[PDB]
Amino acid sequence: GVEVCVKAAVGHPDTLGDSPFSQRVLLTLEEKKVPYEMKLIDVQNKPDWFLKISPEGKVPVFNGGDGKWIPDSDVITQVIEEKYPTPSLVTPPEYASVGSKIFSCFTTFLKSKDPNDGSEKALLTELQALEEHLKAHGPFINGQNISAADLSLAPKLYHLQVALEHFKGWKIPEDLTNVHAYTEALFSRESFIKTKAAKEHLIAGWAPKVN
Ligand SMILES: N[C@@H](CCC(=O)N[C@@H](CS)C(=O)NCC(=O)O)C(=O)O
Ligand SMILES: [Ca+2]
């Protein structure tokens, strides 16, 4: 029986939290139609049973039914890919780094309290790179079929959209039309709706880090 431990919403131990890494794992299981049990962990009050199988307190951790719990969403999604090959979510190596700097740039811009430090511009450069890629090879990162890269990137774009609009009133420019089509499509997938954090909980997660 497949099981995954993931972070709960801050202050709400029985509600899904907002880790994009955990969401990547949950999306992978959902899209592959793999039945799983989800255990929510209050990462500010971890239970001892959890500390025993995850001694460093890491989440997500995944139990594939083979008598062990493994961390790291990169690794976990590879294990799931190998165990449940169909639908294939393999992203070709040539596109594996598409969008790879968007999240770090987003977090730097979010936390910046200087409008002129170039953090916005850096983020825009990465979004424009995503735009050109989707333009030439969309609608997903690898064209017609959804793949791993999408399930890694979409959770991170969700954070970007929600947090930047809330805390800075900032939106991805409307002229990046392929990026907008991309986020509208990914965020409205059944799997995404099922596995995302309610926006107020994601905002609560970021609030102490913004100020
Ligand atoms: N300033 C850190 C925030 C703390 C952190 O370790 N991870 C982030 C990105 S997942 C986080 O937990 N943000 C609050 C949240 O996701 O609710 C960052 O930019 O990554
Ligand atoms: Ca919501």
Side-chain angles (χ1 to χ4, degrees):
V2 170
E3 299 184 16
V4 61
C5 294
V6 305
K7 175 167 70 176
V10 294
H12 296 86
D14 282 286
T15 301
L16 183 55
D18 71 346
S19 167
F21 304 106
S22 289
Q23 194 188 5
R24 174 194 189 176
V25 174
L26 300 178
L27 287 173
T28 297
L29 294 164
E30 290 290 334
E31 292 288 342
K32 286 180 177 281
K33 315 305 294 192
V34 181
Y36 65 98
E37 171 179 16
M38 177 175 77
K39 304 299 300 181
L40 299 173
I41 302 305
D42 181 353
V43 296
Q44 289 186 307
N45 186 36
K46 300 176 198 77
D48 191 63
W49 66 262
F50 173 71
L51 293 159
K52 284 176 164 119
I53 53 95
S54 194
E56 294 198 284
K58 295 178 170 174
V59 274
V61 283
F62 170 87
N63 189 311
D66 60 347
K68 73 185 179 180
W69 290 90
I70 60 172
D72 191 341
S73 73
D74 287 328
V75 176
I76 293 166
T77 57
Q78 297 183 36
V79 167
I80 295 166
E81 193 68 41
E82 299 161 355
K83 189 178 176 202
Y84 309 96
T86 314
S88 180
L89 301 179
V90 180
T91 304
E94 40 270 45
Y95 303 139
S97 83
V98 169
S100 71
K101 299 203 185 321
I102 290 185
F103 195 64
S104 61
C105 283
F106 141 72
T107 59
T108 302
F109 177 51
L110 177 65
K111 280 140 61 184
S112 171
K113 289 320 293 300
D114 176 7
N116 286 116
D117 71 348
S119 54
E120 177 179 23
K121 186 166 177 183
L123 174 67
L124 289 171
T125 305
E126 300 311 323
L127 293 169
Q128 278 156 24
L130 179 62
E131 176 75 18
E132 291 302 323
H133 172 86
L134 293 169
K135 185 183 207 48
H137 305 86
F140 294 108
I141 278 158
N142 188 37
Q144 221 165 104
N145 294 321
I146 197 167
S147 66
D150 304 299
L151 307 185
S152 170
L153 188 55
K156 293 167 162 180
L157 297 171
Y158 181 64
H159 279 257
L160 186 157
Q161 172 180 295
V162 179
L164 290 180
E165 170 62 41
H166 190 254
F167 290 104
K168 296 215 173 192
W170 188 99
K171 293 161 52 198
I172 293 170
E174 281 307 317
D175 54 23
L176 297 181
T177 60
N178 290 276
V179 175
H180 276 280
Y182 183 81
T183 59
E184 288 174 25
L186 274 286
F187 297 169
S188 58
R189 290 181 79 80
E190 284 190 9
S191 64
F192 201 89
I193 299 176
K194 188 179 174 67
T195 60
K196 75 182 185 68
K199 291 181 195 179
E200 63 271 20
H201 298 317
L202 183 153
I203 291 165
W206 278 108
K209 297 159 188 305
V210 171
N211 306 97

mmCIF file of all heavy atoms in Angstrom, residues 38-65:
data_model
loop_
_atom_site.group_PDB
_atom_site.id
_atom_site.type_symbol
_atom_site.label_atom_id
_atom_site.label_comp_id
_atom_site.label_asym_id
_atom_site.label_seq_id
_atom_site.Cartn_x
_atom_site.Cartn_y
_atom_site.Cartn_z
ATOM 1 N N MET A 38 -2.713 9.345 2.330
ATOM 2 C CA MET A 38 -1.980 10.558 2.660
ATOM 3 C C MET A 38 -2.031 10.784 4.170
ATOM 4 O O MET A 38 -3.096 10.722 4.766
ATOM 5 C CB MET A 38 -2.557 11.759 1.903
ATOM 6 C CG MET A 38 -1.903 13.084 2.228
ATOM 7 S SD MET A 38 -2.513 14.447 1.201
ATOM 8 C CE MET A 38 -4.102 14.769 1.963
ATOM 9 N N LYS A 39 -0.864 10.996 4.773
ATOM 10 C CA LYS A 39 -0.737 11.352 6.175
ATOM 11 C C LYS A 39 -0.303 12.799 6.265
ATOM 12 O O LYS A 39 0.750 13.150 5.744
ATOM 13 C CB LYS A 39 0.303 10.462 6.866
ATOM 14 C CG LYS A 39 0.039 8.931 6.762
ATOM 15 C CD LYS A 39 -1.278 8.550 7.406
ATOM 16 C CE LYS A 39 -1.310 8.916 8.886
ATOM 17 N NZ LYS A 39 -2.594 8.512 9.532
ATOM 18 N N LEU A 40 -1.103 13.628 6.921
ATOM 19 C CA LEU A 40 -0.741 15.027 7.111
ATOM 20 C C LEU A 40 0.088 15.198 8.368
ATOM 21 O O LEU A 40 -0.265 14.698 9.430
ATOM 22 C CB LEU A 40 -1.988 15.904 7.227
ATOM 23 C CG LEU A 40 -2.913 15.901 6.013
ATOM 24 C CD1 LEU A 40 -4.169 16.668 6.340
ATOM 25 C CD2 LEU A 40 -2.210 16.526 4.839
ATOM 26 N N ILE A 41 1.185 15.930 8.238
ATOM 27 C CA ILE A 41 2.120 16.141 9.331
ATOM 28 C C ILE A 41 2.108 17.616 9.706
ATOM 29 O O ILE A 41 2.344 18.463 8.847
ATOM 30 C CB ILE A 41 3.577 15.738 8.915
ATOM 31 C CG1 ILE A 41 3.659 14.275 8.477
ATOM 32 C CG2 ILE A 41 4.582 16.026 10.011
ATOM 33 C CD1 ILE A 41 3.129 13.267 9.513
ATOM 34 N N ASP A 42 1.821 17.930 10.974
ATOM 35 C CA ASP A 42 2.013 19.274 11.479
ATOM 36 C C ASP A 42 3.519 19.458 11.678
ATOM 37 O O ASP A 42 4.075 18.911 12.621
ATOM 38 C CB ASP A 42 1.255 19.475 12.808
ATOM 39 C CG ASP A 42 1.399 20.884 13.359
ATOM 40 O OD1 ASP A 42 2.188 21.683 12.794
ATOM 41 O OD2 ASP A 42 0.709 21.201 14.359
ATOM 42 N N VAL A 43 4.180 20.207 10.794
ATOM 43 C CA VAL A 43 5.628 20.257 10.881
ATOM 44 C C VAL A 43 6.102 21.106 12.048
ATOM 45 O O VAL A 43 7.298 21.141 12.340
ATOM 46 C CB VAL A 43 6.260 20.764 9.572
ATOM 47 C CG1 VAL A 43 5.976 19.779 8.446
ATOM 48 C CG2 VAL A 43 5.761 22.147 9.245
ATOM 49 N N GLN A 44 5.173 21.763 12.751
ATOM 50 C CA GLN A 44 5.523 22.412 14.007
ATOM 51 C C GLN A 44 5.191 21.563 15.235
ATOM 52 O O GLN A 44 5.422 21.976 16.358
ATOM 53 C CB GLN A 44 4.828 23.763 14.132
ATOM 54 C CG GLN A 44 5.385 24.800 13.179
ATOM 55 C CD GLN A 44 4.779 26.155 13.433
ATOM 56 O OE1 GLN A 44 3.564 26.295 13.459
ATOM 57 N NE2 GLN A 44 5.621 27.158 13.644
ATOM 58 N N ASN A 45 4.636 20.379 15.006
ATOM 59 C CA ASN A 45 4.354 19.441 16.086
ATOM 60 C C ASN A 45 4.408 18.031 15.523
ATOM 61 O O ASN A 45 3.390 17.355 15.396
ATOM 62 C CB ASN A 45 2.984 19.732 16.693
ATOM 63 C CG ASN A 45 2.686 18.885 17.913
ATOM 64 O OD1 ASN A 45 3.569 18.573 18.709
ATOM 65 N ND2 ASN A 45 1.424 18.508 18.061
ATOM 66 N N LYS A 46 5.601 17.589 15.146
ATOM 67 C CA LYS A 46 5.696 16.303 14.453
ATOM 68 C C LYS A 46 5.438 15.164 15.423
ATOM 69 O O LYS A 46 5.894 15.207 16.559
ATOM 70 C CB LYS A 46 7.067 16.148 13.809
ATOM 71 C CG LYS A 46 7.369 17.243 12.791
ATOM 72 C CD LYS A 46 8.785 17.096 12.255
ATOM 73 C CE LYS A 46 9.280 18.390 11.577
ATOM 74 N NZ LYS A 46 9.676 19.432 12.574
ATOM 75 N N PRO A 47 4.688 14.147 14.970
ATOM 76 C CA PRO A 47 4.416 13.005 15.866
ATOM 77 C C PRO A 47 5.608 12.051 15.952
ATOM 78 O O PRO A 47 6.358 11.955 14.977
ATOM 79 C CB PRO A 47 3.194 12.341 15.213
ATOM 80 C CG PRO A 47 3.250 12.709 13.789
ATOM 81 C CD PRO A 47 3.970 14.051 13.691
ATOM 82 N N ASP A 48 5.810 11.352 17.081
ATOM 83 C CA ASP A 48 7.039 10.563 17.174
ATOM 84 C C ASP A 48 7.084 9.424 16.166
ATOM 85 O O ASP A 48 8.170 9.040 15.716
ATOM 86 C CB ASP A 48 7.270 9.993 18.571
ATOM 87 C CG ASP A 48 8.668 9.406 18.711
ATOM 88 O OD1 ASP A 48 9.657 10.182 18.593
ATOM 89 O OD2 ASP A 48 8.777 8.174 18.894
ATOM 90 N N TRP A 49 5.919 8.913 15.764
ATOM 91 C CA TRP A 49 5.913 7.804 14.819
ATOM 92 C C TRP A 49 6.525 8.283 13.522
ATOM 93 O O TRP A 49 7.234 7.543 12.852
ATOM 94 C CB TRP A 49 4.497 7.251 14.574
ATOM 95 C CG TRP A 49 3.540 8.197 13.874
ATOM 96 C CD1 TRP A 49 2.595 8.991 14.463
ATOM 97 C CD2 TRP A 49 3.420 8.411 12.466
ATOM 98 N NE1 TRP A 49 1.906 9.697 13.510
ATOM 99 C CE2 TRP A 49 2.390 9.357 12.274
ATOM 100 C CE3 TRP A 49 4.079 7.894 11.346
ATOM 101 C CZ2 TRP A 49 2.012 9.805 11.004
ATOM 102 C CZ3 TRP A 49 3.700 8.350 10.081
ATOM 103 C CH2 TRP A 49 2.677 9.289 9.929
ATOM 104 N N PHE A 50 6.259 9.544 13.202
ATOM 105 C CA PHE A 50 6.805 10.149 11.995
ATOM 106 C C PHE A 50 8.313 10.408 12.103
ATOM 107 O O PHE A 50 9.054 10.180 11.152
ATOM 108 C CB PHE A 50 6.079 11.459 11.677
ATOM 109 C CG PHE A 50 6.707 12.207 10.545
ATOM 110 C CD1 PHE A 50 6.605 11.742 9.245
ATOM 111 C CD2 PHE A 50 7.464 13.340 10.795
ATOM 112 C CE1 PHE A 50 7.229 12.439 8.208
ATOM 113 C CE2 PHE A 50 8.086 14.030 9.764
ATOM 114 C CZ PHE A 50 7.974 13.561 8.468
ATOM 115 N N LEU A 51 8.763 10.891 13.257
ATOM 116 C CA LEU A 51 10.191 11.121 13.483
ATOM 117 C C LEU A 51 10.972 9.817 13.400
ATOM 118 O O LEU A 51 12.146 9.807 13.039
ATOM 119 C CB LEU A 51 10.425 11.782 14.838
ATOM 120 C CG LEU A 51 9.878 13.202 14.909
ATOM 121 C CD1 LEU A 51 9.665 13.598 16.361
ATOM 122 C CD2 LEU A 51 10.849 14.152 14.223
ATOM 123 N N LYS A 52 10.322 8.712 13.734
ATOM 124 C CA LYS A 52 11.026 7.441 13.662
ATOM 125 C C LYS A 52 11.320 7.022 12.218
ATOM 126 O O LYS A 52 12.374 6.444 11.945
ATOM 127 C CB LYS A 52 10.229 6.358 14.393
ATOM 128 C CG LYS A 52 10.345 6.461 15.915
ATOM 129 C CD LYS A 52 9.465 5.448 16.649
ATOM 130 C CE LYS A 52 9.901 5.303 18.107
ATOM 131 N NZ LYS A 52 8.844 5.689 19.097
ATOM 132 N N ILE A 53 10.416 7.322 11.288
ATOM 133 C CA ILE A 53 10.636 6.929 9.900
ATOM 134 C C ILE A 53 11.248 8.061 9.073
ATOM 135 O O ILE A 53 11.727 7.837 7.954
ATOM 136 C CB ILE A 53 9.327 6.433 9.233
ATOM 137 C CG1 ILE A 53 8.198 7.449 9.375
ATOM 138 C CG2 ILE A 53 8.919 5.080 9.844
ATOM 139 C CD1 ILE A 53 8.050 8.359 8.198
ATOM 140 N N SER A 54 11.236 9.274 9.632
ATOM 141 C CA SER A 54 11.827 10.431 8.981
ATOM 142 C C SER A 54 12.618 11.242 10.002
ATOM 143 O O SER A 54 12.144 12.295 10.460
ATOM 144 C CB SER A 54 10.738 11.292 8.345
ATOM 145 O OG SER A 54 11.309 12.228 7.447
ATOM 146 N N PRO A 55 13.808 10.754 10.375
ATOM 147 C CA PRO A 55 14.531 11.260 11.550
ATOM 148 C C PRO A 55 14.969 12.714 11.441
ATOM 149 O O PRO A 55 15.263 13.331 12.468
ATOM 150 C CB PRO A 55 15.762 10.348 11.623
ATOM 151 C CG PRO A 55 15.364 9.120 10.896
ATOM 152 C CD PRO A 55 14.486 9.583 9.784
ATOM 153 N N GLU A 56 15.071 13.234 10.227
ATOM 154 C CA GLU A 56 15.458 14.620 10.055
ATOM 155 C C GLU A 56 14.231 15.501 9.900
ATOM 156 O O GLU A 56 14.345 16.709 9.653
ATOM 157 C CB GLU A 56 16.383 14.803 8.852
ATOM 158 C CG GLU A 56 17.729 14.119 9.027
ATOM 159 C CD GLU A 56 18.763 14.653 8.061
ATOM 160 O OE1 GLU A 56 18.710 14.286 6.870
ATOM 161 O OE2 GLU A 56 19.618 15.457 8.490
ATOM 162 N N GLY A 57 13.055 14.906 10.037
ATOM 163 C CA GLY A 57 11.821 15.670 9.919
ATOM 164 C C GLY A 57 11.394 16.060 8.514
ATOM 165 O O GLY A 57 10.454 16.830 8.326
ATOM 166 N N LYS A 58 12.065 15.483 7.525
ATOM 167 C CA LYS A 58 11.810 15.782 6.129
ATOM 168 C C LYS A 58 10.441 15.346 5.648
ATOM 169 O O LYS A 58 9.996 14.228 5.942
ATOM 170 C CB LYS A 58 12.849 15.093 5.240
ATOM 171 C CG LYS A 58 14.267 15.586 5.425
ATOM 172 C CD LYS A 58 15.219 14.806 4.541
ATOM 173 C CE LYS A 58 16.600 15.452 4.536
ATOM 174 N NZ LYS A 58 17.603 14.633 3.800
ATOM 175 N N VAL A 59 9.786 16.239 4.909
ATOM 176 C CA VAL A 59 8.609 15.917 4.120
ATOM 177 C C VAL A 59 8.728 16.542 2.738
ATOM 178 O O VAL A 59 9.262 17.636 2.604
ATOM 179 C CB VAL A 59 7.282 16.428 4.738
ATOM 180 C CG1 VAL A 59 6.724 15.417 5.743
ATOM 181 C CG2 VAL A 59 7.476 17.786 5.335
ATOM 182 N N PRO A 60 8.216 15.873 1.704
ATOM 183 C CA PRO A 60 7.471 14.614 1.670
ATOM 184 C C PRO A 60 8.343 13.404 1.930
ATOM 185 O O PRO A 60 9.535 13.442 1.653
ATOM 186 C CB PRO A 60 6.919 14.573 0.229
ATOM 187 C CG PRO A 60 7.883 15.368 -0.569
ATOM 188 C CD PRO A 60 8.319 16.480 0.370
ATOM 189 N N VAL A 61 7.752 12.356 2.497
ATOM 190 C CA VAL A 61 8.411 11.047 2.408
ATOM 191 C C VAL A 61 7.387 10.055 1.874
ATOM 192 O O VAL A 61 6.180 10.168 2.126
ATOM 193 C CB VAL A 61 9.000 10.511 3.752
ATOM 194 C CG1 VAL A 61 10.336 11.223 4.085
ATOM 195 C CG2 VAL A 61 7.973 10.603 4.894
ATOM 196 N N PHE A 62 7.893 9.083 1.120
ATOM 197 C CA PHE A 62 7.060 8.189 0.313
ATOM 198 C C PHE A 62 7.349 6.739 0.683
ATOM 199 O O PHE A 62 8.499 6.348 0.805
ATOM 200 C CB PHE A 62 7.356 8.447 -1.177
ATOM 201 C CG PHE A 62 6.765 7.449 -2.125
ATOM 202 C CD1 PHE A 62 5.467 7.611 -2.601
ATOM 203 C CD2 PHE A 62 7.530 6.394 -2.606
ATOM 204 C CE1 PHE A 62 4.931 6.708 -3.511
ATOM 205 C CE2 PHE A 62 6.997 5.479 -3.511
ATOM 206 C CZ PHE A 62 5.692 5.642 -3.961
ATOM 207 N N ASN A 63 6.296 5.960 0.877
ATOM 208 C CA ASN A 63 6.435 4.530 1.123
ATOM 209 C C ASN A 63 5.748 3.801 -0.013
ATOM 210 O O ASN A 63 4.526 3.853 -0.127
ATOM 211 C CB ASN A 63 5.842 4.119 2.477
ATOM 212 C CG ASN A 63 6.178 2.661 2.845
ATOM 213 O OD1 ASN A 63 6.007 1.757 2.030
ATOM 214 N ND2 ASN A 63 6.673 2.438 4.065
ATOM 215 N N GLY A 64 6.543 3.151 -0.859
ATOM 216 C CA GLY A 64 5.998 2.518 -2.048
ATOM 217 C C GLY A 64 5.466 1.126 -1.806
ATOM 218 O O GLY A 64 5.165 0.406 -2.761
ATOM 219 N N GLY A 65 5.355 0.741 -0.537
ATOM 220 C CA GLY A 65 4.970 -0.624 -0.184
ATOM 221 C C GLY A 65 6.128 -1.612 -0.114
ATOM 222 O O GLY A 65 5.926 -2.825 -0.089
#
